[PDB]
């Protein structure tokens, strides 16, 4: 069989081959192959296993991995990629001890980014986002989820969504778009938040017709949107055919997790303050818990989401950068992996499954990304490390040697 490409001399290969999301104990069952090969033809994986799996094939292009570690391209299931300006001028408020919510309550935070995003032209946001997405790619992310939510109005929310589609069609990273019009409350709506929510819901039909988003998200937090508003909002979104996601129980056990499970949301994200009942509902419903360790770290806190309890309870855990200018300005998914190990107390095996398979399922791409097996798009990363434990171990840097998307190297050294 004549094929396009073959990777040889792979020191360690992680296919992450699974039949579905990995919950509980299965997150620990990492299949490791040594001295492996990977065959690619017409942008797809034709084989990925131990040396000898290439018997019967002959490739034209041969890539020597020189004993390096090879894994599927990484999946970042939660980001706010498109945004205007930056929030460095808020560093001092945080340092002074002003809480994240108090900054928001005073017209800052998300609202500050909303003003800059509304003012930035669509072309500026595109170029701006292109730079950050290119960096994400250089760190190993070949598939990512991007949320709007910095417009809080028709014009800018649609603008963010169009930029996301544009990005998806003009660079390597495959993007999953999420509409998060219900991110915060414009000051002029503080007295009628339900009216604001209805105006955001009024956008679903055109967003749907334009295929501008596949999911709907919402910030269920004290002072922001309540559980009842979130239930009504999300149920409405589901009726329109949108998948469901939620920024839940970021500080306190508000019942955001319980709601997400009851609504059978694809994922519940953040969850630092979630209760045991919430954890049980997520596991029971199969709702993926996307943890954002960088956000906790960046907020200057030390109390992280209870990942071990979630895994002990059969929850499917994932990880993300939550890349956003306000609470987690980092594109480095590898650092997220390091923080998960050091502060979420997750093992290297669990972390790898979290940033590939589980991240993929968290955004409706379980059948398309996160695994290197026959038929899958040839998206992989060749690492500057001999083993998988080394990646989360050595922190704050970029271990990427080369990144392959659709069978072509898109990042070199
Ligand atoms: Zn977020």
């Amino acid at each position: 069989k004549q094929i396009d490409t073959i990777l040889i001399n792979i020191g360690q290969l992680l296919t992450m081959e699974s039949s579905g999301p990995r919950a509980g104990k299965s997150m620990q069952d990492l299949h490791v192959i040594e001295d492996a090969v990977v065959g690619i033809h017409e942008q797809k994986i034709v084989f990925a296993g131990q040396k000898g799996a290439e018997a019967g094939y002959e490739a034209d292009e041969i890539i020597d991995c020189s004993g390096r570690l090879v894994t599927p391209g990484l999946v970042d299931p939660h980001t706010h990629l498109v945004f205007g300006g930056s929030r460095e001028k808020e560093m001092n408020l945080k340092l002074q001890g002003i809480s994240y919510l108090d900054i928001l309550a005073q017209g800052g935070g998300i609202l500050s980014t909303v003003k800059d995003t509304r003012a930035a032209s669509e072309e500026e946001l595109l170029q701006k986002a292109h730079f950050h997405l290119q960096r994400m790619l250089s760190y190993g992310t070949t598939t990512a989820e991007v949320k709007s939510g910095y417009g809080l109005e028709k014009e800018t929310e649609l603008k963010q969504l169009r930029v996301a589609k544009k990005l998806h069609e003009s660079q390597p990273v495959d993007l999953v778009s999420t509409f998060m019009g219900a991110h915060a409350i414009p000051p002029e709506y503080q007295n009628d938040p339900d009216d604001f929510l209805d105006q955001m819901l009024s956008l679903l039909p055109e967003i749907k017709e334009q295929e501008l988003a596949s999911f709907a998200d919402i910030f269920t937090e004290t002072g922001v949107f309540t559980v009842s508003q979130s239930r009504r909002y999300l149920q409405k979104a589901a009726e329109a055919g949108f998948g469901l996601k939620i920024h839940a129980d970021e500080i306190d056990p508000l019942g955001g997790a319980e709601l997400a499970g009851k609504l059978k949301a694809v994922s519940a994200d953040h969850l630092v303050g979630t209760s045991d009942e919430g954890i049980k509902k997520l596991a029971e419903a199969g709702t993926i818990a996307v943890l954002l360790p960088g956000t906790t770290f960046y907020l200057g806190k030390s109390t992280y989401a209870r990942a071990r309890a979630m895994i002990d309870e059969g929850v499917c855990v994932s990880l993300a950068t939550d890349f956003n200018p306000g609470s987690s300005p980092t594109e480095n998914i590898q650092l997220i992996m390091s923080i998960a190990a050091l502060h979420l107390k997750m093992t290297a095996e669990e972390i790898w499954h979290a940033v590939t398979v589980n991240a993929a399922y968290a955004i409706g791409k379980g059948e398309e990304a996160g695994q290197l097996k026959a038929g899958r798009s040839a998206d992989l990363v060749i690492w500057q490390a001999p083993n998988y434990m080394y990646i989360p171990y050595h922190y704050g840097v970029n271990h990427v040697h080369q990144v392959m998307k659709n069978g072509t190297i898109v990042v070199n050294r």
Side-chain angles (χ1 to χ4, degrees), residues 222-273:
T222 296
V224 191
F225 300 116
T226 63
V227 174
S228 64
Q229 296 175 315
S230 301
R231 166 177 278 284
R232 174 171 79 83
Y233 189 82
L234 295 178
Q235 290 188 311
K236 188 64 181 178
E239 287 182 352
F242 292 82
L244 276 34
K245 290 175 160 294
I246 182 175
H247 277 57
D249 313 327
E250 307 203 340
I251 307 181
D252 302 299
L254 299 175
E258 290 90 310
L259 177 63
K262 295 172 191 169
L263 299 181
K264 299 181 183 183
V266 66
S267 75
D269 306 40
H270 200 303
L271 301 167
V272 170

Side-chain angles (χ1 to χ4, degrees), residues 121 141 164 181 212 218 222-223 264 278 292 322 361 399:
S121 75
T141 303
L212 287 166
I218 185 163
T222 296
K264 299 181 183 183
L292 316 174
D322 189 25
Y361 277 90
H399 293 299

Side-chain angles (χ1 to χ4, degrees), residues 2-126 128-133 135-279 281-314:
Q2 303 307 310
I3 58 175
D4 301 316
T5 312
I6 184 177
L7 274 60
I8 67 171
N9 189 38
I10 296 173
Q12 208 172 65
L13 197 217
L14 305 187
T15 65
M16 306 300 183
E17 184 166 5
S18 309
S19 60
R22 280 174 184 264
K25 291 189 181 66
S26 68
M27 285 187 79
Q28 185 59 41
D29 182 29
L30 181 75
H31 183 55
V32 190
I33 303 176
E34 306 186 305
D35 188 11
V37 294
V38 173
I40 298 119
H41 189 53
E42 317 196 81
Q43 302 176 65
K44 295 164 181 283
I45 299 292
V46 288
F47 67 72
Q50 191 175 178
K51 183 177 183 174
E54 75 280 12
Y57 302 75
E58 295 192 306
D60 290 315
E61 166 186 47
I62 169 173
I63 300 178
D64 182 1
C65 292
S66 300
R68 296 196 178 77
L69 163 68
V70 175
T71 71
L74 304 183
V75 180
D76 196 347
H78 182 138
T79 78
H80 302 248
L81 208 226
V82 184
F83 63 85
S86 45
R87 308 244 286 279
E88 62 263 37
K89 286 186 177 179
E90 292 189 339
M91 284 191 284
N92 264 113
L93 296 182
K94 178 161 56 180
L95 176 157
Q96 286 183 53
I98 305 178
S99 70
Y100 177 71
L101 291 184
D102 281 346
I103 296 178
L104 174 60
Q106 289 297 300
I110 291 162
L111 294 179
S112 178
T113 297
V114 165
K115 302 187 80 174
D116 296 328
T117 307
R118 290 180 174 179
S121 75
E122 180 166 351
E123 185 50 54
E124 295 186 297
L125 289 179
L126 178 55
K128 192 168 191 289
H130 257 306
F131 172 78
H132 291 298
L133 186 52
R135 184 178 272 161
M136 287 171 54
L137 206 225
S138 66
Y139 279 94
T141 303
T142 52
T143 294
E145 187 258 15
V146 295
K147 311 168 191 295
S148 56
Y150 283 139
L152 307 185
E153 56 161 39
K154 181 175 181 179
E155 188 178 6
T156 302
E157 286 292 338
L158 292 184
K159 177 172 58 178
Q160 294 189 83
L161 296 175
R162 292 196 301 272
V163 171
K165 178 183 296 177
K166 217 80 64 59
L167 290 163
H168 177 268
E169 295 170 356
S170 60
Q171 53 72 60
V173 186
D174 283 340
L175 306 175
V176 166
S177 171
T178 295
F179 170 58
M180 186 174 199
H183 199 179
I185 304 172
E188 69 278 21
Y189 282 96
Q190 266 307 328
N191 295 318
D192 199 354
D194 286 298
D195 183 8
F196 171 73
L197 289 175
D198 288 320
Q199 287 185 56
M200 290 299 91
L201 288 169
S202 70
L203 306 181
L204 299 188
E206 64 196 284
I207 289 173
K208 179 177 188 172
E209 187 276 350
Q210 245 76 61
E211 301 174 296
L212 287 166
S214 299
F215 300 82
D217 201 327
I218 185 163
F219 190 21
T220 308
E221 181 61 272
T222 296
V224 191
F225 300 116
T226 63
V227 174
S228 64
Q229 296 175 315
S230 301
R231 166 177 278 284
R232 174 171 79 83
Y233 189 82
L234 295 178
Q235 290 188 311
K236 188 64 181 178
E239 287 182 352
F242 292 82
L244 276 34
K245 290 175 160 294
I246 182 175
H247 277 57
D249 313 327
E250 307 203 340
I251 307 181
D252 302 299
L254 299 175
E258 290 90 310
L259 177 63
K262 295 172 191 169
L263 299 181
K264 299 181 183 183
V266 66
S267 75
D269 306 40
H270 200 303
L271 301 167
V272 170
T274 206
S275 65
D276 288 336
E277 301 66 56
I279 294 181
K281 246 299 179 179
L282 296 176
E284 169 190 299
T287 296
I288 300 176
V290 184
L291 306 185
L292 316 174
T295 306
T296 291
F297 166 77
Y298 196 74
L299 287 165
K301 309 296 188 180
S302 280
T303 302
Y304 293 74
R306 307 151 62 200
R308 182 51 54 200
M310 296 183 182
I311 296 171
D312 279 331
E313 213 55 55

